Design an enzyme around this catalytic site. Structure first.
Site, PDB file in Angstrom:
ATOM      1  N   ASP A  57      35.316  24.295 -46.765  1.00 48.26           N
ATOM      2  CA  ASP A  57      34.924  23.742 -45.472  1.00 48.26           C
ATOM      3  C   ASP A  57      35.897  23.385 -44.707  1.00 48.26           C
ATOM      4  O   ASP A  57      36.856  22.439 -45.104  1.00 48.26           O
ATOM      5  CB  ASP A  57      33.710  22.549 -45.646  1.00 48.26           C
ATOM      6  N   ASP A 138      15.794  16.917 -60.232  1.00 48.66           N
ATOM      7  CA  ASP A 138      15.150  17.186 -61.677  1.00 48.66           C
ATOM      8  C   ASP A 138      15.573  18.502 -62.284  1.00 48.66           C
ATOM      9  O   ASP A 138      15.656  18.750 -63.754  1.00 48.66           O
ATOM     10  CB  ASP A 138      13.545  16.949 -61.939  1.00 48.66           C
ATOM     11  N   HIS A 142      17.646  18.732 -65.589  1.00 50.64           N
ATOM     12  CA  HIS A 142      16.910  19.409 -66.353  1.00 50.64           C
ATOM     13  C   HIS A 142      17.848  20.514 -67.115  1.00 50.64           C
ATOM     14  O   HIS A 142      18.102  20.746 -68.305  1.00 50.64           O
ATOM     15  CB  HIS A 142      15.682  20.113 -65.929  1.00 50.64           C
ATOM     16  N   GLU A 143      18.568  21.468 -66.362  1.00 49.13           N
ATOM     17  CA  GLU A 143      19.254  22.372 -66.826  1.00 49.13           C
ATOM     18  C   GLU A 143      20.805  21.883 -67.408  1.00 49.13           C
ATOM     19  O   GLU A 143      21.056  22.479 -68.509  1.00 49.13           O
ATOM     20  CB  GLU A 143      19.797  23.486 -65.493  1.00 49.13           C
ATOM     21  N   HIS A 146      20.299  21.011 -71.044  1.00 48.22           N
ATOM     22  CA  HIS A 146      20.195  22.106 -71.906  1.00 48.22           C
ATOM     23  C   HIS A 146      21.726  22.098 -72.558  1.00 48.22           C
ATOM     24  O   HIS A 146      21.764  22.189 -73.657  1.00 48.22           O
ATOM     25  CB  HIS A 146      19.675  23.619 -71.416  1.00 48.22           C
ATOM     26  N   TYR A 157      15.858  28.003 -79.416  1.00 44.71           N
ATOM     27  CA  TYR A 157      14.850  28.063 -77.973  1.00 44.71           C
ATOM     28  C   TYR A 157      13.748  29.016 -78.268  1.00 44.71           C
ATOM     29  O   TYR A 157      13.486  29.994 -77.653  1.00 44.71           O
ATOM     30  CB  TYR A 157      15.817  28.630 -77.016  1.00 44.71           C
ATOM     31  N   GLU A 166      12.711  22.184 -74.295  1.00 45.95           N
ATOM     32  CA  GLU A 166      12.360  22.141 -72.950  1.00 45.95           C
ATOM     33  C   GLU A 166      11.983  20.889 -72.445  1.00 45.95           C
ATOM     34  O   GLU A 166      12.216  20.239 -71.290  1.00 45.95           O
ATOM     35  CB  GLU A 166      11.394  23.048 -72.675  1.00 45.95           C
ATOM     36  N   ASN A 183      13.173   9.578 -54.714  1.00 46.52           N
ATOM     37  CA  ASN A 183      11.704  10.235 -54.525  1.00 46.52           C
ATOM     38  C   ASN A 183      11.019  10.707 -56.041  1.00 46.52           C
ATOM     39  O   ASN A 183      10.485  11.970 -56.362  1.00 46.52           O
ATOM     40  CB  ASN A 183      11.447  11.251 -53.746  1.00 46.52           C
ATOM     41  N   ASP A 185       9.337  10.863 -59.517  1.00 47.22           N
ATOM     42  CA  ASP A 185       7.768  11.085 -60.214  1.00 47.22           C
ATOM     43  C   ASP A 185       7.915  11.715 -61.473  1.00 47.22           C
ATOM     44  O   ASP A 185       9.094  11.901 -62.093  1.00 47.22           O
ATOM     45  CB  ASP A 185       6.961  12.137 -59.281  1.00 47.22           C
ATOM     46  N   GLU A 190       9.046  19.603 -57.914  1.00 41.92           N
ATOM     47  CA  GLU A 190       8.045  19.438 -56.910  1.00 41.92           C
ATOM     48  C   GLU A 190       9.040  19.575 -55.424  1.00 41.92           C
ATOM     49  O   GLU A 190       8.445  19.968 -54.478  1.00 41.92           O
ATOM     50  CB  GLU A 190       7.390  18.013 -56.948  1.00 41.92           C
ATOM     51  N   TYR A 193       9.657  23.904 -55.230  1.00 41.71           N
ATOM     52  CA  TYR A 193       8.790  24.904 -55.617  1.00 41.71           C
ATOM     53  C   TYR A 193       7.820  24.864 -54.251  1.00 41.71           C
ATOM     54  O   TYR A 193       7.196  24.018 -53.653  1.00 41.71           O
ATOM     55  CB  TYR A 193       7.753  24.429 -56.731  1.00 41.71           C
ATOM     56  N   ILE A 197       3.041  24.719 -50.038  1.00 42.67           N
ATOM     57  CA  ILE A 197       2.026  23.952 -50.644  1.00 42.67           C
ATOM     58  C   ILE A 197       2.624  22.633 -50.861  1.00 42.67           C
ATOM     59  O   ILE A 197       3.487  22.362 -51.745  1.00 42.67           O
ATOM     60  CB  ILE A 197       1.598  24.806 -51.757  1.00 42.67           C
TER      61      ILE A 197
END
Ligand SMILES: [Ca+2]
Ligand SMILES: [Ca+2]
Ligand SMILES: [Ca+2]
Ligand SMILES: [Ca+2]
Ligand SMILES: [Cl-]
Ligand SMILES: [Cl-]
Ligand code: NA
Ligand SMILES: [Zn+2]
Ligand SMILES: [Zn+2]
Ligand SMILES: [Zn+2]
Length: 316
Positions: A57, A138, A142-143, A146, A157, A166, A183, A185, A190, A193, A197
């Protein structure tokens, strides 16, 4: 690259501002020299060749829409590093300060993020199912978890081992999200995704059934899809973990919650000391009971609550 450690500013995928560690050498690169052997973030420029180019950059300001997924992959890799370092005394994913490399803008409309053995890879999503996946702390954690699993227990797996695999990644993904303290939870994904919605996610640890996942061993999935249900049967262990932390009454069994930090200590110890590549749910329960025993004593509330939680989700 060699250069000067600098601090840039930008906006991530959800439009929030954050400072990021960069390295200056004509251009400002997403290279953070302050954590282990470095955090490096790469632009895959919509191709599938990896890692792509170390992100450069001109002005150390990362407010362009195209910049957002790089800002978050880079920043959340940092937060995930800090969580493992500060909370568990673990240095990077391998415990030896290995470089954390991430590539964003991988492919086109790619609705996935993954650890590939050497680095993190993030799709941008198709704009309907997902926005760029590095926007979810998350998902990042999460990844990366792994990789921690592969360097520790080496959980297979497939089937119940794969569902524990998992769940470990959802549990530490969520504990990093709480650690980052913006934030948090007990849902997964969330932030990235279905931008159309509000208030949904890929799966819920507090109520797996909300999204069709089992919340009790008597409901375990036993077909062959999803590698014997690894994203499905994880709900059973996710719920046990949620109960250990937060407490609740689940199928009439009362669990006294012991909080997040103790959940993390107990599962991190189970993962690194006790689980093996083919640990099943019953062996995870035993590993967790033994870990709680090591840390708190066989007569502790902590051990009693681990037992109540596993009882509640029908795992003996
Ligand atoms: Ca710029
Ligand atoms: Ca959240
Ligand atoms: Ca979440
Ligand atoms: Ca959504
Ligand atoms: Cl429930
Ligand atoms: Cl219930
Ligand atoms: Na589902
Ligand atoms: Zn994954
Ligand atoms: Zn996973
Ligand atoms: Zn319940």
């Amino acid at each position: 690259i060699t250069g000067t450690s600098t601090v840039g500013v930008g906006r991530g995928v959800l439009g929030d501002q954050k400072n990021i560690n960069t390295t200056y050498s004509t251009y400002y690169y997403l290279q953070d020299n302050t954590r282990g052997d470095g955090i490096f973030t790469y632009d895959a420029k919509y191709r599938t060749t990896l890692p792509g180019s170390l992100w450069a950059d001109a002005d150390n300001q990362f407010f362009a829409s195209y910049d957002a997924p790089a800002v978050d992959a880079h920043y959340y890799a940092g937060v995930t590093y800090d969580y493992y370092k500060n909370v568990h005394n673990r240095l990077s994913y391998d415990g030896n300060n290995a470089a954390i490399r991430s590539s964003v803008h991988y492919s086109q409309g790619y609705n996935n993020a993954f650890w590939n053995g050497s680095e993190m890879v993030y799709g941008d999503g198709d704009g309907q199912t997902f926005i760029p996946l590095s926007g979810g702390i998350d998902v990042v954690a999460h990844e990366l978890t792994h990789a921690v699993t592969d360097y520790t227990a080496g959980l297979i797996y497939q089937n119940e081992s794969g569902a524990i695999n998992e769940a470990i990644s959802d549990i530490f993904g969520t504990l990093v999200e709480f650690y980052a303290n913006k934030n948090p939870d007990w849902e997964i994904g969330e932030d990235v995704y279905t931008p159309g919605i509000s208030g949904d996610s890929l799966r819920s640890m507090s109520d797996p059934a909300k999204y069709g996942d089992p919340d009790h061993y008597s409901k375990r999935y036993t077909g062959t899809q999803d590698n014997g249900g690894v994203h499905i049967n994880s709900g059973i262990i996710n719920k046990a973990a949620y109960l250990i932390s937060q407490g609740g009454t689940h199928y009439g069994v009362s669990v006294v919650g012991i909080g997040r930090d103790k959940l993390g200590k107990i599962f991190y110890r189970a993962l690194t000391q006790y689980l093996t590549p083919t640990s099943n749910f019953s062996q995870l329960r035993a590993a967790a009971v033994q870990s709680a025993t090591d840390l708190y004593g066989s007569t502790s509330q902590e051990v009693a609550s681990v037992k109540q939680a596993f009882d509640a989700v029908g795992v003996k």
